[PDB]
Amino acid sequence: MFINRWLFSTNHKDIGTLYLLFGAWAGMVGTALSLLIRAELGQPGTLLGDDQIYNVVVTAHAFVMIFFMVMPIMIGGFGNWLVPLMIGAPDMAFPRMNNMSFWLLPPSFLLLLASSMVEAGAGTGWTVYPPLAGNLAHAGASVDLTIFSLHLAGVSSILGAINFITTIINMKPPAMSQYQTPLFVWSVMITAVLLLLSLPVLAAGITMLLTDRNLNTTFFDPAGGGDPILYQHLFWFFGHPEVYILILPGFGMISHIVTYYSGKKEPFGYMGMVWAMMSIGFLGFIVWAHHMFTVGMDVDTRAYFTSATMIIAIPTGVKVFSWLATLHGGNIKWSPAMMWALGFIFLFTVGGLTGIVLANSSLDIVLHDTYYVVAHFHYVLSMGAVFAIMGGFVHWFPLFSGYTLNDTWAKIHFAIMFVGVNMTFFPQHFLGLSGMPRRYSDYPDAYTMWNTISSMGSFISLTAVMLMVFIIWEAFASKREVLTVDLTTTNLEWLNGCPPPYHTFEEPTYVNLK
Amino acid sequence: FENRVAEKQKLFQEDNGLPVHLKGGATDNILYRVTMTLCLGGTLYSLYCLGWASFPHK
Amino acid sequence: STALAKPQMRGLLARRLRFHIVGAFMVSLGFATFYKFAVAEKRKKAYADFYRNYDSMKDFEEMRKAGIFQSAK
Amino acid sequence: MAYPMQLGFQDATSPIMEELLHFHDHTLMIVFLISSLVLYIISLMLTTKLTHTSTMDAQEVETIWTILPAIILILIALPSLRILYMMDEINNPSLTVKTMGHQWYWSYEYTDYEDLSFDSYMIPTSELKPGELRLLEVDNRVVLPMEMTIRMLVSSEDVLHSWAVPSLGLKTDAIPGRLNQTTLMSSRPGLYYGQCSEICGSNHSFMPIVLELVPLKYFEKWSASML
Amino acid sequence: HYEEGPGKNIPFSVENKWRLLAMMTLFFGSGFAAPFFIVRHQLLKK
Amino acid sequence: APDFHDKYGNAVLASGATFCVAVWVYMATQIGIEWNPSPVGRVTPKEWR
Amino acid sequence: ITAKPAKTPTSPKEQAIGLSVTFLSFLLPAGWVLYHLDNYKKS
Amino acid sequence: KIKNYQTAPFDSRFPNQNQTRNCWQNYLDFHRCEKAMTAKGGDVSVCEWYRRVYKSLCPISWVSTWDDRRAEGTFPGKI
Amino acid sequence: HETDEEFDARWVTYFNKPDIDAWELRKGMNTLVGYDLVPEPKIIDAALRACRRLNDFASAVRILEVVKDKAGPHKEIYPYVIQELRPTLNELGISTPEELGLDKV
Amino acid sequence: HQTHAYHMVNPSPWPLTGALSALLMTSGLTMWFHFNSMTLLMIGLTTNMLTMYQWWRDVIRESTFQGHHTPAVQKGLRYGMILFIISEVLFFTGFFWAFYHSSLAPTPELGGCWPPTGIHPLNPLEVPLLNTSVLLASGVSITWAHHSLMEGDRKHMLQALFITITLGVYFTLLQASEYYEAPFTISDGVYGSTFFVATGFHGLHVIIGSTFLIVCFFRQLKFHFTSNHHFGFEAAAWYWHFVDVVWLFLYVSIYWWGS
Amino acid sequence: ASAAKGDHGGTGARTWRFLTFGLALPSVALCTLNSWLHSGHRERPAFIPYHHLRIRTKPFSWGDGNHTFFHNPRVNPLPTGYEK
Amino acid sequence: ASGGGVPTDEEQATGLEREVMLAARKGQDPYNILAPKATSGTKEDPNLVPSITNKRIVGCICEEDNSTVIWFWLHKGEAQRCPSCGTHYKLVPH
Amino acid sequence: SVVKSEDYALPSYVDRRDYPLPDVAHVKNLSASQKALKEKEKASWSSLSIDEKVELYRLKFKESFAEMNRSTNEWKTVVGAAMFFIGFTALLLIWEKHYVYGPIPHTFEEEWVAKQTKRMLDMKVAPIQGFSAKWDYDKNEWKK
Numbered sequence A: 001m002f003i004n005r006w007l008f009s010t011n012h013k014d015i016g017t018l019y020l021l022f023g024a025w026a027g028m029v030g031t032a033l034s035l036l037i038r039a040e041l042g043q044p045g046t047l048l049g050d051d052q053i054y055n056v057v058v059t060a061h062a063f064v065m066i067f068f069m070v071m072p073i074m075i076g077g078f079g080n081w082l083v084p085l086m087i088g089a090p091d092m093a094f095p096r097m098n099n100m101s102f103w104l105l106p107p108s109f110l111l112l113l114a115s116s117m118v119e120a121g122a123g124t125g126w127t128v129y130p131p132l133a134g135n136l137a138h139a140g141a142s143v144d145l146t147i148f149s150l151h152l153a154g155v156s157s158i159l160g161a162i163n164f165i166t167t168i169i170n171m172k173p174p175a176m177s178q179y180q181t182p183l184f185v186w187s188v189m190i191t192a193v194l195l196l197l198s199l200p201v202l203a204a205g206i207t208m209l210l211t212d213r214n215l216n217t218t219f220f221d222p223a224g225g226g227d228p229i230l231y232q233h234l235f236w237f238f239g240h241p242e243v244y245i246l247i248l249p250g251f252g253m254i255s256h257i258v259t260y261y262s263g264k265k266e267p268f269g270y271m272g273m274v275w276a277m278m279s280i281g282f283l284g285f286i287v288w289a290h291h292m293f294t295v296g297m298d299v300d301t302r303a304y305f306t307s308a309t310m311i312i313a314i315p316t317g318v319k320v321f322s323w324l325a326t327l328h329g330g331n332i333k334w335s336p337a338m339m340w341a342l343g344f345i346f347l348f349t350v351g352g353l354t355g356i357v358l359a360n361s362s363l364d365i366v367l368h369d370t371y372y373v374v375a376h377f378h379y380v381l382s383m384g385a386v387f388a389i390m391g392g393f394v395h396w397f398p399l400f401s402g403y404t405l406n407d408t409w410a411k412i413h414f415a416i417m418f419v420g421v422n423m424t425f426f427p428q429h430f431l432g433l434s435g436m437p438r439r440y441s442d443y444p445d446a447y448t449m450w451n452t453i454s455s456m457g458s459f460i461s462l463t464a465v466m467l468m469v470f471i472i473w474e475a476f477a478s479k480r481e482v483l484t485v486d487l488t489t490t491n492l493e494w495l496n497g498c499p500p501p502y503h504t505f506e507e508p509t510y511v512n513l514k
Numbered sequence B: 001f002e003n004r005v006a007e008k009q010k011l012f013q014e015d016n017g018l019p020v021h022l023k024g025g026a027t028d029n030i031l032y033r034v035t036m037t038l039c040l041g042g043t044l045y046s047l048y049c050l051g052w053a054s055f056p057h058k
Numbered sequence C: 001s002t003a004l005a006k007p008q009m010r011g012l013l014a015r016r017l018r019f020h021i022v023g024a025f026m027v028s029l030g031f032a033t034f035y036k037f038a039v040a041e042k043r044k045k046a047y048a049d050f051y052r053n054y055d056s057m058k059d060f061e062e063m064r065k066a067g068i069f070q071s072a073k
Numbered sequence D: 001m002a003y004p005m006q007l008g009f010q011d012a013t014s015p016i017m018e019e020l021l022h023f024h025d026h027t028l029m030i031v032f033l034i035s036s037l038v039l040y041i042i043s044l045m046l047t048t049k050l051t052h053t054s055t056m057d058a059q060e061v062e063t064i065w066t067i068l069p070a071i072i073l074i075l076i077a078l079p080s081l082r083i084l085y086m087m088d089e090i091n092n093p094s095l096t097v098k099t100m101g102h103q104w105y106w107s108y109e110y111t112d113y114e115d116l117s118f119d120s121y122m123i124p125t126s127e128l129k130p131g132e133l134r135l136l137e138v139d140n141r142v143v144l145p146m147e148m149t150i151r152m153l154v155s156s157e158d159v160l161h162s163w164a165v166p167s168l169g170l171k172t173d174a175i176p177g178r179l180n181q182t183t184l185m186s187s188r189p190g191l192y193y194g195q196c197s198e199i200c201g202s203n204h205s206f207m208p209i210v211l212e213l214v215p216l217k218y219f220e221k222w223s224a225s226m227l
Numbered sequence E: 001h002y003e004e005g006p007g008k009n010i011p012f013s014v015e016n017k018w019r020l021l022a023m024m025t026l027f028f029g030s031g032f033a034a035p036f037f038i039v040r041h042q043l044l045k046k
Numbered sequence F: 001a002p003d004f005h006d007k008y009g010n011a012v013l014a015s016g017a018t019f020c021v022a023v024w025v026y027m028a029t030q031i032g033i034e035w036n037p038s039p040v041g042r043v044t045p046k047e048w049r
Numbered sequence G: 001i002t003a004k005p006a007k008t009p010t011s012p013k014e015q016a017i018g019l020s021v022t023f024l025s026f027l028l029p030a031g032w033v034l035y036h037l038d039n040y041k042k043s
Numbered sequence H: 001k002i003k004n005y006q007t008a009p010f011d012s013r014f015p016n017q018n019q020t021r022n023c024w025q026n027y028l029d030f031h032r033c034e035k036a037m038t039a040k041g042g043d044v045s046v047c048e049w050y051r052r053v054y055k056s057l058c059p060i061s062w063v064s065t066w067d068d069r070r071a072e073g074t075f076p077g078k079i
Numbered sequence I: 001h002e003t004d005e006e007f008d009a010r011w012v013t014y015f016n017k018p019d020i021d022a023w024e025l026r027k028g029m030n031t032l033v034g035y036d037l038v039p040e041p042k043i044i045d046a047a048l049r050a051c052r053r054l055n056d057f058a059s060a061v062r063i064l065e066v067v068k069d070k071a072g073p074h075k076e077i078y079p080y081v082i083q084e085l086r087p088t089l090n091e092l093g094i095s096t097p098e099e100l101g102l103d104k105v
Numbered sequence J: 001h002q003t004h005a006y007h008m009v010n011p012s013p014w015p016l017t018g019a020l021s022a023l024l025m026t027s028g029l030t031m032w033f034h035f036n037s038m039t040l041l042m043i044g045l046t047t048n049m050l051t052m053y054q055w056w057r058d059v060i061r062e063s064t065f066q067g068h069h070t071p072a073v074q075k076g077l078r079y080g081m082i083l084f085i086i087s088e089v090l091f092f093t094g095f096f097w098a099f100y101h102s103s104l105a106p107t108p109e110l111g112g113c114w115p116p117t118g119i120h121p122l123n124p125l126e127v128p129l130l131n132t133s134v135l136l137a138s139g140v141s142i143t144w145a146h147h148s149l150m151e152g153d154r155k156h157m158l159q160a161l162f163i164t165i166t167l168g169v170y171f172t173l174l175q176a177s178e179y180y181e182a183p184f185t186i187s188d189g190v191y192g193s194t195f196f197v198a199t200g201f202h203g204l205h206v207i208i209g210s211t212f213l214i215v216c217f218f219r220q221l222k223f224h225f226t227s228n229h230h231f232g233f234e235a236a237a238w239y240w241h242f243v244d245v246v247w248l249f250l251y252v253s254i255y256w257w258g259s
Numbered sequence K: 001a002s003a004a005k006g007d008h009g010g011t012g013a014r015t016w017r018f019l020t021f022g023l024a025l026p027s028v029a030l031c032t033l034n035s036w037l038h039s040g041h042r043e044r045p046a047f048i049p050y051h052h053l054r055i056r057t058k059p060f061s062w063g064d065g066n067h068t069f070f071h072n073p074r075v076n077p078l079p080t081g082y083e084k
Numbered sequence L: 001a002s003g004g005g006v007p008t009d010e011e012q013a014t015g016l017e018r019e020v021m022l023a024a025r026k027g028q029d030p031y032n033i034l035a036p037k038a039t040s041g042t043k044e045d046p047n048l049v050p051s052i053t054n055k056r057i058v059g060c061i062c063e064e065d066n067s068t069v070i071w072f073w074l075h076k077g078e079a080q081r082c083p084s085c086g087t088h089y090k091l092v093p094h
Numbered sequence M: 001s002v003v004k005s006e007d008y009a010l011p012s013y014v015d016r017r018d019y020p021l022p023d024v025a026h027v028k029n030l031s032a033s034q035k036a037l038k039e040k041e042k043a044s045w046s047s048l049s050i051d052e053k054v055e056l057y058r059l060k061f062k063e064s065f066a067e068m069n070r071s072t073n074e075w076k077t078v079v080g081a082a083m084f085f086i087g088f089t090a091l092l093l094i095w096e097k098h099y100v101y102g103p104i105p106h107t108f109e110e111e112w113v114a115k116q117t118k119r120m121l122d123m124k125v126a127p128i129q130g131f132s133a134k135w136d137y138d139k140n141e142w143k144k
């Protein structure tokens, strides 16, 4: 029975639960790696005495947080749990292929850990640029294990994307048009389209790197007429859509959380929110070379990428102002999930605005490959994704588990986290403006003060993470069972109780056309 | 060839509680066991290979 | 005693919003300059004042005499 | 170079860097305006017991939310692209210098007239002379004539590197098989520091760049003596 | 069929809070510990 | 009936604040952390050549 | 949300134990590694 | 004529950041010129300009590699 | 989009329906408090008399509470509304939340 | 009992065996590339084939034998196949991008020309043209197969499908021969790299497509397909058209324009 | 374009078979004939050890590590030239 | 030129596929493939909601093109009303 | 009173200032005296005593508006506990400084810094605003 249920699952809820467990475990790995980064930088000099190991830690930090924590939690975890419930569907379109998307991830993670254990690891950056990642500067198995890890994660998400698109297009009640589906469902749909188109380009690029490393191809090797810059194009052609992939389900959860704790039946300007996510998804495919402003590109190309990149602020602003307009006139409930969402809105805005600074290629010359970029994305991506994830987790924990969290503990956790992340990352703006490069194990002495503060901040967030674990333990230890949930009329995922039965919507909802 | 779909329909719709991957009979069980044994054995061997490869032979 | 006068009862939220968005804007436009006057104009003046009578050769000589250069003793 | 507790950019050494400073001021002003507006509005939304929970009409307010940000972006893009195209203009250099990235050091070639080339390595911490800067000093500095337009050509003989000098506003990736061009002009004599700005392996942190800017006559004699 | 309801729709037992504590400790603890031991491993290689 | 916060709130606030300030002040000033603040108005420049 | 009182209440004492055990599960192994860093290099 | 050579002048054929082709073209031009001049028993020194330009622009290792490959019979450009 | 007077008249008519049922009373009040307004005394009067026809004293008191609540920090609104309603309160024997001690925390 | 039309699938081991086969194939390629050994890889390939066989077997059992493929379930599979094909198009796009990047700006190492110095391209008017006529012909014969099936014609469906498969095999054998005859190799710089990787992935897809057609052929032999319900056939046909079109882009870009 | 054929009355199996046997397979037969004449060995290219060709950055994982997967002794020289 | 040998759905469709096919021929929708058309939704003319049990979730799109759907359990017994628009629904078990 | 898990699909009671009249009464079952009170409620409400009026209210509703909207001392616990854990973090940082970190480079020694400071002024580091601009080269001191 255990094996049938947990290894052979064809159930969207159980598979969602598997993803959440996987993602939580990955979050602990990614967090440990981040602390090692900040420990090395916490005082001037060397802590590890081995900068190849430093670079391996940085590289793994990124892959773990992106591919094993964020994507599995948002798309695999919340997507699987919530999407079928929110459209009254009995499961995903391909419930068995769904299970393979999950089971591909532990082997993918195993390949990443193998890369770090063999030889000297892959000390490449999560970008894995040749020639550093090539077979001369990184001889041996590490980089190939990294490529294979990415292959498996790629296949997992591509099949997942096919599953979500099909489910969302095909499995709504017959009367429900796409313009009657909740925003989170939209956000998963759009994310899945981005995955479907972008991951195969990455797969092509890393396959070419694999063949350069093992089959004597020279796609990226000038000796054979290749070009290291070609790899960068292929990687970032995936890599920009990827950053939008990482935030979109977050925007979706934020819309639900803000609506809910404002006591509203609906988000402000639903069609504008749909429009904004689609526009962001589209524009996300035409801006990638803003990651390459220093590689030696022509001026007109730089002017174009600067302009196209800035335009994304417009639909994004529509979403930010619509969240504010959702709060407007709300009966505000200061739940822990609401606090996460409010934190998300402001931290995402800060990071988005530093993105606009970076979009300007002239300024990016001086800011590229400095801590200003690291600060930008830890606000918009790291805080944005994590705050949306924590908001969604606290909000829907009682749905998934049937048990309540202690709200006071959860508020304490939010408070510690808010202080920690801002102490960690805010000073990194100063480090970047003043010229400290990223991907460094040590820094000229002038940079000591901000690096010291930033590392102290990282320990504060460690305390918050440890507390998060205790809080989840306390919920399961105490077993306060859910009774009534407000606003079920506009939050269908709650209407089958907590937790919902294994099989829901065996009899589908009735929705007439009028 | 004769159309024997109706016979297969009867076999696979028999009310015997068996999951589809075992509903053909004893041969399904064998093929399943072979597959899972190769997968689990191969996975253990991959772990061994990792252990071996994680250490230098200077 | 006397009766209480009839107060405004409608659009209290919208009226609050109308009032404060002007204040939200006026901070901005009132502030606008703070970064502008205290940072931007200060910076333009610092660069203008520095270079107005700047003598690069004299600057070099002071550096040379202080012993900082590999190429110039 | 950076100094302790620095918040913003290193002081500009070139006119283009001065332009970047004022453009950053302009943009950051706008960034502060927006972030504060958002913070203010958020607090406003959250500080009243008054409620209005029925359906609100979206289209009127969405015009403002789209048009004003569009205008703001144009107000950033206009000076942004002015500087971009000024950076790109033809300037006629008096001198060409090449730099080749290596693991982990820079080499320099000045081959307009004679074959002058040398390697440039970080001074190890244990060998710093009193008052010298940890991780920043090199054995052989890039000596260059001040107040002159210099063409820098940047490449690599192994992995990617990136040749940067923040106070001149310079960062040009060093790519094997490719010859990237940038222009360099210092308004002042002195020493101007930079660091490798593409991850190139285990000593990425330890291959800095030091420019030494002096009068032409000194540059010429130094050049001759370096043959 | 399967057990349904709170504490039953999960692959781990919550029947005893102390056994649960031990399991959550091993689970999150192994994930957090792993990078430190990978670093130790790499340092010990030379 | 008074809840947890009614009974212990004042004490948790007071002790929490006192403990936090004391330990951070101690960590910041007493254990040899080198913050490397600006030389400006602090350091007397000394002959190096 | 409303909920039932805890089926198996977790007292302040039990919370202190769960919290302490949790923090130690993160701190001790990492602490052990970091404390012995110099031993790993000098080996 | 244009002695007082300082450095390679701007070339409108190669106005962008990537100057690889500029170095390459001048290298080719110099050696083609030298070969054409020697074939006709003429003054090689009319080719000098291209040598100055490619010497200014081209990394030493590229020139050196190209020279080795011309001597080896493996230079892939047409001369 | 109709005057204030037309809005009020519609609502008065809503609650004045002789055979208004419990569901329609709840629907009315719960919808009305979603708007950016404190309902005029004449709306509330009509809603209170509906409570009377529905033999529901408690809902009458609750309606008075929600009037106070919708006014937010505008402390002058509720005492004014109660003032205007006093003849109805007296006629129907409706005690205010305050008179019942239901304003105590 | 359900009153929707969707398929609740029996708990299945094949996702896990599939995932493990992926681990075994990738760790196996690693072992092959670095530790001079083929064992893990061979086990991975074997378990992969076993997984695919039993998984698709079960899909056939679920549909032909158990009747779970209602119109709503079939429609889902249509979207699924279309989306899979789109992902495969983008995969090839990355290789076409690599080809155009290299060939439009040939570096000095190549002689600054395309095709590079020392490269003697195949004549696109010889076997590559034959290949083109073969796959185009196979697009015509597969359409004949589809119409015969819809018209209830068992014999002509089988004949047309057999012809299509024979053409697939012919292309595959022609390509294997051309690979052997080619005077340039995968190690001949970016020309060899782009040529063999792009046409090689295409060749793999031709093999996959041919196999899928063969599966349909044997299912047809066994009367699985009705004149109205035959999604496995549709789809093998879509995938086959996809493979044809990729060929046409390869022929135009690499063989013709890049010669 | 309408090709130059011109059928359409009902798009059926008969029409597609007509196209298979009347156009598609005859084109293949023609191209097959065409190939069967321009077949035969084109002379093997003289060996020049160009550095952009015969790339070896890592030995191949088969044979002696120096032979490509579809190595053809007649036309594929090694880095050191044609095999003896 | 053209014989038979290919089975039809009528001859060979089985299980749920066959049920759906046979019910569609009768103009029936027991597996909820079609959106039901609304009545006037008064208490006299309620929307009739079939169910195989004693309760079923209703989603009410109160006005055409509303993006917000209003969801509630409809129980066996007297007609219930949408909490947003008041339109009436009544469960008809089976 | 007693709400059960298996009742999730039924209309439920809630106290919410934006939903004043919930779908069901707080108290569903009535005792003999409570039944008599509901009968009395059908006659003039002026004949009801204050206690009877309160009892009728409490049958219909759980908490009053004033009760459900009351402020709490929770913020004290939240802020205090947050500060406690932030304080606990400094203990980990003290441990790290003592047991993990070794000495920082010699370049942070006071004499080094003084010499390096002079050399930075000699090379006129950030002479427009940042560093050397704050040094008075005439009076040989930091500007006031």
Ligand SMILES: CCCCCCCCCCCCCCCCCC(=O)OCC(COC(=O)CCCCCCCCCCCCCCCCC)OC(=O)CCCCCCCCCCCCCCCCC
Pocket (backbone or CB within 6 Å): A350, A353, A354, A422, A423, A426, A427, A429, A430, A433, D007, D008, D009, D028, D031, D032, D035, D036, D039
């Ligand atoms: C952490 C250490 C801070 C140290 C600050 C040094 C003091 C200035 C020296 C006192 C002045 C001494 C004279 C030196 C002037 C040098 C100025 C310069 O040459 O260069 C320019 C400087 C100028 O910047 C500053 O001048 C820093 C001010 C910080 C901006 C406001 C953020 C809130 C305050 C920060 C502390 C909280 C941290 C939590 C982070 C919060 C996230 C924003 O460098 C930057 O570009 C900073 C990059 C920030 C870009 C992100 C946008 C942030 C938007 C958020 C608004 C929040 C609303 C407040 C309301 C906030 C409520 C939440």
Ligand code: HEA
Pocket (backbone or CB within 6 Å): A243, A244, A246, A247, A290, A291, A309, A310, A312, A313, A314, A316, A317, A318, A320, A348, A349, A350, A351, A352, A353, A354, A355, A356, A358, A359, A360, A364, A367, A368, A369, A373, A376, A377, A380, A381, A382, A384, A385, D034, D038, D068, D069, D070, D072, D073
């Ligand atoms: C969540 C993930 C995420 C998101 C959403 C974004 C959003 C954006 N990012 Fe970011 N970014 C990353 C994650 C993300 N980023 C990562 C991981 C990297 C580096 C990877 C690496 O190198 O390892 C990166 C790097 C990166 C670079 C490259 C810098 C460099 O390496 O030199 C650039 C440059 O243009 C960029 C720009 C932008 C812009 C313009 C947006 C915009 O979409 C933001 C739009 C939002 C706002 C502007 C705020 C809200 C709007 C309003 C309140 C309206 C009014 C505002 C205005 C009118 C301005 N980012």
Ligand SMILES: CCCCC/C=C\C/C=C/C/C=C\C/C=C\CCCC(=O)O[C@H](COC(=O)CCCCCCCCCCCCCCCCC)COP(=O)(O)OCCN
Pocket (backbone or CB within 6 Å): A151, A154, A155, A200, A203, A207, A211, A215, J029, J172, J175, J176, J179, J180, J181, J182, J183, J184, J185, J186, J187, J196, J197, J199, J200, J201, J203, J204, K068, K069, K070, K071, K072, K076
């Ligand atoms: C008739 C055409 C059909 C092709 C069938 C041939 C077998 C190879 C397999 C095909 C798969 C194609 C892509 C793999 C890339 C390389 C093979 C390219 C095709 C090929 O077969 O190229 C051959 C070289 O093969 C070689 O290296 C052999 C190397 C074989 C090992 C391949 C390494 C595995 C690559 C991993 C694939 C990653 C997949 C990613 C999936 C995406 C996940 C999202 C050419 O021979 P040659 O002697 O150099 O030149 C001819 C000289 N007479």
Ligand SMILES: CCCCCC/C=C\CCCCCCCCCC(=O)O[C@H](COC(=O)CCCCCCCCCCCCCCC)COP(=O)(O)OC[C@@H](O)CO
Pocket (backbone or CB within 6 Å): J052, J056, J057, J059, J060, J063, J064, J069, J077, J081, J207, J208, J209, J211, J212, J215, J224, J225, J226, J229, J230, J231, J232, J233, J235, L012, L013
């Ligand atoms: C050297 C080779 C090694 C590489 C490994 C790959 C090997 C080859 C695999 C060949 C693909 C075989 C797929 C066979 C699927 C058979 C099952 C099937 O076709 O199932 C059909 C449904 O379609 C469905 O699931 C559709 C399922 C579609 C499957 C998609 C096939 C493409 C798979 C490609 C996989 C790798 C590609 C990526 C490579 C980089 C069943 O419905 P019907 O047909 O309507 O029948 C019902 C009627 O009888 C009722 O009257």
Ligand SMILES: CCCCCCCCCCO[C@@H]1O[C@H](CO)[C@@H](O[C@H]2O[C@H](CO)[C@@H](O)[C@H](O)[C@H]2O)[C@H](O)[C@H]1O
Pocket (backbone or CB within 6 Å): A035, A036, A039, G027, G028, G029, G030, G031, G032, G033, G035, M092, M095, M096, M099
């Ligand atoms: C980035 C992550 C941050 C982690 C912060 C860690 C905070 C500290 C947790 C305690 O860790 C323990 O510290 C002891 C020292 O205090 C170590 O004992 C060591 O030192 C003792 C005293 O010298 C000896 O008794 C022991 O044998 C010797 O193992 C012990 O191994 C280690 O587990």
Ligand code: CUA
Pocket (backbone or CB within 6 Å): D101, D102, D103, D104, D105, D160, D161, D162, D196, D197, D198, D199, D200, D201, D203, D204, D205, D207
């Ligand atoms: Cu060289 Cu980084």
Ligand SMILES: [Cu+2]
Pocket (backbone or CB within 6 Å): A239, A240, A243, A287, A288, A290, A291
């Ligand atoms: Cu991007």
Ligand SMILES: [Mg+2]
Pocket (backbone or CB within 6 Å): A294, A368, A369, D162, D197, D198
């Ligand atoms: Mg870079």
Ligand code: NA
Pocket (backbone or CB within 6 Å): A040, A041, A042, A043, A044, A045, A046, A047, A441, A442, A443
């Ligand atoms: Na360090």
Ligand code: NA
Pocket (backbone or CB within 6 Å): J146, J150, J230, J234
């Ligand atoms: Na068909």
Ligand SMILES: [Zn+2]
Pocket (backbone or CB within 6 Å): L060, L061, L062, L070, L082, L083, L084, L085, L086, L087
């Ligand atoms: Zn309705």
